[PDB]
Amino acid sequence: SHMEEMIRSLQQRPEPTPEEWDLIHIATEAHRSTNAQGSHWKQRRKFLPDDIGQSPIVSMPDGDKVDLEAFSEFTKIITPAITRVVDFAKKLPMFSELPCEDQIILLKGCCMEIMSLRAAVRYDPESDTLTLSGEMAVKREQLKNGGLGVVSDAIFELGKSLSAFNLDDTEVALLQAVLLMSTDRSGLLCVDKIEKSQEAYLLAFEHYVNHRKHNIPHFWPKLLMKVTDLRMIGACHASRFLHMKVECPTELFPPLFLEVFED
Ligand SMILES: Cc1cc(OCC(=O)O)cc(C)c1Cc1ccc(O)c(C(C)C)c1
């Protein structure tokens, strides 16, 4: 009984309004359809072979060498992963209504954040791998040695901790939306449309969490601190990406990878 829940409680936990449920369903299918979901075609997905990613040897300024071969294997699969993120965003109405200029900024802004989340939630405890591009299951050491350095460690620990959050497609979808609709970027026009779009998404997202009634204490603040986890991952990665670019030939960076991550 809703009225009793309402009286008895300390504060109120509103569930999604119809307008928000529409927002949630569009977001949920946006993410599902650009997730390399669990469909037929993606669930053909092999571990990265154990002899790859064990030979880090190209020196990076912070001392954490890079396995050239493992690196190449990851750049070889990264373009579709970046593209899927673009498709995700394009399928959100509040995104596509935005000036093209704003859209690029927003995607550059959050691409790694969304990719990292996407891997994070694909963390698998019995194998101790993340799944990259819906396809490649990799271990902590492999991804670490293959380019990402301590950014691998961060995604793994994020993925490990998210295990018990039992996120469903929606929660990951709305997390992405919150990440995407961020005004922590320079050079946007619709700084206010974007803030309002993030508010609506946060509002629908908490309201949805309310609906799910996870049996973790303080789920929503916790699920909010994960967002800053992700921004920190994105920021470490932007930094290691510049050092990736200093140390390695452009031949190894796929045009799109270069594009999403150049300043
Ligand atoms: C390759 C890759 C794919 C990926 O897929 C996310 C998804 O499922 O869409 C998610 C992550 C986190 C990575 C890893 C990655 C992410 C950024 C980056 O600069 C590098 C270089 C070492 C090639 C690797």
User: Where do the structural domains in the chain lie, given as residue ranges?
Assistant: 1-263
**∠ CA 220-226-227, rounded to 5°:** 95
Strand pairing category for 136-139 and 129-132: antiparallel
Of the CA atoms within 13 Å of residue 185, those in its CB half-sphere come to: 27
Dist. CA 213 → ligand 1 center (Å): 32
Helix (H, G, I), strand (E, B) or coil at 114: helix
**Whose CA is closest to 103, among 224, 185, 18, 20?**
185
CA distances from 236 to 97, 141, 168, 241 (A): 31, 18, 27, 8
Question: Does domain 1-263 sit in CATH 1.10.565.10?
Answer: yes
Contact criterion met (CB below 8 Å) for 84 and 256: no
Please identify, by atom number, the ligand 1 atom nearest to the C-alpha of residue 115. Answer: 6
Q: Which two tokens stand for residue 99?
A: 């000036």
Dist. CA 153 → ligand 1 center (Å): 13
**Whose CA is closest to 48, among 127, 139, 147, 128?**
139
Q: Which resolution, in Å, applies to this structure?
A: 2.5
Dist. CA 98 → ligand 1 center (Å): 26
Please identify, by atom number, the ligand 1 atom nearest to the C-alpha of residue 80. Answer: 9
**Whose CA is closest to 28, among 204, 210, 150?**
204
Please identify, by atom number, the ligand 1 atom nearest to the C-alpha of residue 36. Answer: 8
**∠ CA 251-107-252, rounded to 5°:** 10
Q: How far apart are alpha carbons 214 and 164 in whole angstroms? A: 10
**Whose CA is closest to 49, among 137, 157, 110?**
137
Method: X-ray
DSSP label of 71: H
Kindly report the backbone phi and psi dihedral angles of residue 12, in degrees, each rounded to the nearest multiple of 5, phi listed first. Answer: -90, 145
DSSP label of 163: G
Dist. CA 248 → ligand 1 center (Å): 17
- CA torsion sign for 214, 215, 216, 218 is positive
| Beta-carbon contacts of residue 25 (< 8 Å; ≥ 6 apart) | none
Q: Ligand 1, atom 7: nearest CA belongs to which residue?
A: 133
Q: Which residues line ligand 1 (CB under 6 A)?
A: 71, 74-75, 77-78, 81, 84, 112, 115-116, 118-119, 132-134, 146-148, 155, 241
Dist. CA 185 → ligand 1 center (Å): 21
DSSP label of 57: -
Q: How far apart are alpha carbons 88 and 208 in whole angstroms? A: 20
**Whose CA is closest to 174, among 20, 17, 19?**
20
| Beta-carbon contacts of residue 161 (< 8 Å; ≥ 6 apart) | 226
DSSP-assigned letters across all residues of 205-258: HHHHHHHH--SSTTHHHHHHHHHHHHHHHHHHHHHHHHHHHHHS-GGGS-HHHH
Dist. CA 115 → ligand 1 center (Å): 6
Dist. CA 77 → ligand 1 center (Å): 8
Amino acid identity at 255 = P
Q: How far apart are alpha carbons 99 and 107 in whole angstroms? A: 13
> Tokens 């927002």 map to which residue?
23
Amino acid identity at 118 = R
**Whose CA is closest to 119, among 137, 106, 141, 107?**
137
Q: Which two tokens stand for residue 158?
A: 């994020």
Please identify, by atom number, the ligand 1 atom nearest to the C-alpha of residue 122. Answer: 8
DSSP label of 52: S
Ramachandran bin of 12, using left for φ above 0, alpha for ψ from -120 to 50, beta for the remaining angles: beta
Which string of b and e fits 102-113 if b means at least 16 CB within 10 Å?
A: bbebbbbbbbbb
Q: Ligand 1, atom 18: nearest CA belongs to which residue?
A: 148
Dist. CA 75 → ligand 1 center (Å): 8
> Tokens 């930094």 map to which residue?
239
Q: Ligand 1, atom 8: nearest CA belongs to which residue?
A: 133
Q: Which runs of E-coded beta strand occur in the chain?
A: 129-132, 136-139
> Tokens 């900024």 map to which residue?
105
Q: How far apart are alpha carbons 117 and 174 in whole angstroms? A: 11
DSSP label of 10: S
Contact criterion met (CB below 8 Å) for 139 and 129: yes
Q: How far apart are alpha carbons 118 and 133 in whole angstroms? A: 9
Q: How far apart are alpha carbons 241 and 261 in whole angstroms? A: 7
Kindly report the backbone phi and psi dihedral angles of residue 35, in degrees, each rounded to the nearest multiple of 5, phi listed first. Answer: -90, 5
Q: Ligand 1, atom 6: nearest CA belongs to which residue?
A: 115
